[PDB]
Design a binder for this molecule. Structure first.
Ligand SMILES: CN1CCc2ccc(Cl)cc2[C@@H]1C(=O)Nc1cncc2ccccc12
Ligand SMILES: [Cl-]
Lengths: 302, 297
C-alpha cells in the first residue's frame, strides 16, 4: 500500500554526469560512450544570447576551448558537432559507467525523473511530467543547464529531456537528447511565454484508479457519462480533452478495479463541480496529474 | 525556481542492494563491506530460529552473483550476514538513528533490484507514509552528507492503515512496533510544525507571499494554537534552526508563525502554496536551504 511520487533510481545517470566549461559558462553534460551531450548555449557570451548564430559561434571554436570534467578527471575533446540545440563533444575516453540507453522523445503528459546537477555533480532527483504546454515544472537554479530527464524501464535508461532554460513564470523548457525543443521555444533570451497550462486528464483518472486500489472510494458515484459530455465539462475546468486512446489506455485499471473509464469520468466531473469538501485523495487536497496510467500500474503491481 | 519533493541521488545505495532468500522468504539486504544487513523476519523466538539455521540456508544474490555466507549474527531486529566478499561498491557510510520530523530518501527494492526512489519524513508517530508492496522488506532510507551515506532506515512492515514501520541500521525499531504479525496500530499522527514553517519560507523564496501578514506571536501563544490543530510543539531549537531562512527572507520566525496561525484558523480559501492546497510538512529547514541554494553530491 501507499502512493508516493516516485522517481527512478538515479545511479545509472549519475555515472554519466560531467561538467562542461566553454569560456566563462559552466553547465552539465551527459557522457555516454565517447560523446558528451550538452546544451549548445554553452558557447554563448553576454551579447550572444538575444540573437545568437550558433553555427557562426561554433565555427570559431576549437576542441581545446571546451573543458570537460568527469569527477576530478579532465576529458580531452577530440571533436565537436551540433545537432539542433544540443552540442555533441567527441571525447578521447568512452565512459565506463555508460549504461544501456536510448534517446526517446516524449509526448505531453508523460512522466520522467530529473537528476538535477550543478557543475557536473548530481544534487537531487525528482519526478515530473511534460506539461500539455510543453514546459516542465522543475526545481532548477542557475547552473542546472544540461540536467537530464529519464525513465529507467527494466535495465535501459531512456533519456528524454535535457534542461536548457527557465521561462519568466518559473517553468522550465528543454529539448529531447537530439536537441529538438519541446514546445515553441528557442534557445534565445527573446520574449518567450509558456502557453496556458491545462490539467492532464488521463493522468488524473489514472491517479483516481490508484486511489481506488488503495481503498479510497468516497469520490465514486452512480453516474456514467458520454466521452463528449465529459470533454465539454473538462474543457471548462482547463482539463485536456480525453481521447479514445486515453480510454483504451485506462482499460487495465478499469478491469482491475471494476469501474468503467466513463464511470470514473463521472467521478471526476463531480469532483470538478464539488471540490473535495475537506477530504483528501491519496493524501492530497488537489487532483494529481503527474502519474501516468503506466506509473499507476507499475507502482500498484510491480 | 521551483520546489519539488526531492530525494538524494540513489547511486551510492544502489551498489549495496542485494537479494536475500531464506527458505520461502525473499527480501532485500544492504551489502556494506563483507556484511549483508537485512530484517531478521527473513528467517517468534528469533534466537531459537537463528540457531537452527546454517550459513548455506541464506542465499544472497548481488546481481547475477551468488555471495557465499560465512557467518550470521543478530543485532536487535536486523540480521547480519557475514559474506566472503567485501562489496567493491561500498561507499563512505555511517549508521545514524534519526528523530521524528527528519527526512530521508527511500530506495524501494524488490528482489535486490532498486525500482524507485522517493523522499519521506519520519512521522512524529514513528511511522513513514511510504510506498511499498510485498518484497520491499529490507529497502533502506538514507541521507547524503558530502560524500558519506548516512543509513537511517530499514523497512520491515506495513501497518493496517497502509503506513510503514521499520528500524535504524542497528535493528532498533522507530516507534512502539515489534516485528511480528499481531495487533499493532500507529499512534495519532501530528503535523511537523518546524517543517511546515520551513516550507512556508521556501514558498516566500519562490515568490508566494499571499499568506504573509503584519502580525507576530509569542512562542507560547503559537504552541497553544498549534496543539489545538494536532501540530507538534515548536521549540526554541526550531526557531533557531529557522534562523537562516528568517534572515534570507526578512520574515522573523514568530512572524511566519502568525501566518501559520492564520492559515490554521482560516484555511487557504481556494488558494495554493507551492502548488499545494495543504500545508506540507515533509521538507526540513535543511532541505529548504539545500534546494534553494544548490548543494551537490
Ligand atoms: C542562465 N541563462 C539565463 C538566460 C537564458 C536564456 C536562454 C537560454 Cl537557452 C538559457 C538561459 C539560461 C537559463 O535560463 N538558465 C537557467 C535554467 N534553469 C533554471 C534557472 C534559474 C535561474 C536562472 C537561470 C536558470
Ligand atoms: Cl510519451
Amino acid at each position: 500500500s501507499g502512493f508516493r511520487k516516485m522517481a527512478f533510481p538515479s545511479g545509472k545517470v549519475e555515472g554519466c554526469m560531467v561538467q562542461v566549461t566553454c569560456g566563462t559558462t559552466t553547465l552539465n553534460g551527459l557522457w555516454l560512450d565517447d560523446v558528451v551531450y550538452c546544451p549548445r548555449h554553452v558557447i554563448c557570451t553576454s551579447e550572444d544570447m538575444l540573437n545568437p548564430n550558433y553555427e557562426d559561434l561554433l565555427i570559431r571554436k576549437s576542441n581545446h576551448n571546451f573543458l570537460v570534467q568527469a569527477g576530478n578527471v579532465q576529458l580531452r575533446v577530440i571533436g565537436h558537432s551540433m545537432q539542433n540545440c544540443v552540442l555533441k563533444l567527441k571525447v578521447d575516453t568512452a565512459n565506463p559507467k555508460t549504461p544501456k540507453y536510448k534517446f526517446v522523445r516524449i509526448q505531453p503528459g508523460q512522466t520522467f525523473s530529473v537528476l538535477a546537477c550543478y557543475n557536473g555533480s548530481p544534487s537531487g532527483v525528482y519526478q515530473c511530467a511534460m506539461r500539455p504546454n510543453f514546459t516542465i515544472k522543475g526545481s532548477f537554479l542557475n547552473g542546472s543547464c544540461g540536467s537530464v530527464g529519464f525513465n529507467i524501464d527494466y535495465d535501459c535508461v531512456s533519456f528524454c529531456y535535457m534542461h536548457h532554460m527557465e521561462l519568466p513564470t518559473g517553468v522550465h523548457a528543454g529539448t529531447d537528447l537530439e536537441g529538438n525543443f519541446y514546445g515553441p521555444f528557442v534557445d534565445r533570451q527573446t520574449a518567450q511565454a509558456a502557453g496556458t497550462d491545462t490539467t492532464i486528464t488521463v493522468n488524473v483518472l489514472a491517479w483516481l484508479y490508484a486511489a481506488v486500489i488503495n481503498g479510497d472510494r468516497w469520490f465514486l458515484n452512480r453516474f456514467t457519462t458520454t466521452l463528449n459530455d465529459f470533454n465539454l465539462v473538462a474543457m471548462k475546468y482547463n482539463y485536456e480533452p480525453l481521447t479514445q486512446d486515453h480510454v483504451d489506455i485506462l482499460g487495465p485499471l478499469s478491469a482491475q478495479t471494476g469501474i468503467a473509464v466513463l464511470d470514473m469520468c463521472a467521478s471526476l466531473k463531480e469532483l470538478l463541480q464539488n471540490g473535495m469538501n475537506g477530504r483528501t485523495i491519496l493524501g492530497s487536497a488537489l487532483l494529481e496529474d503527474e502519474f501516468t496510467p503506466f506509473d499507476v500500474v507499475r507502482q500498484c503491481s510491480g
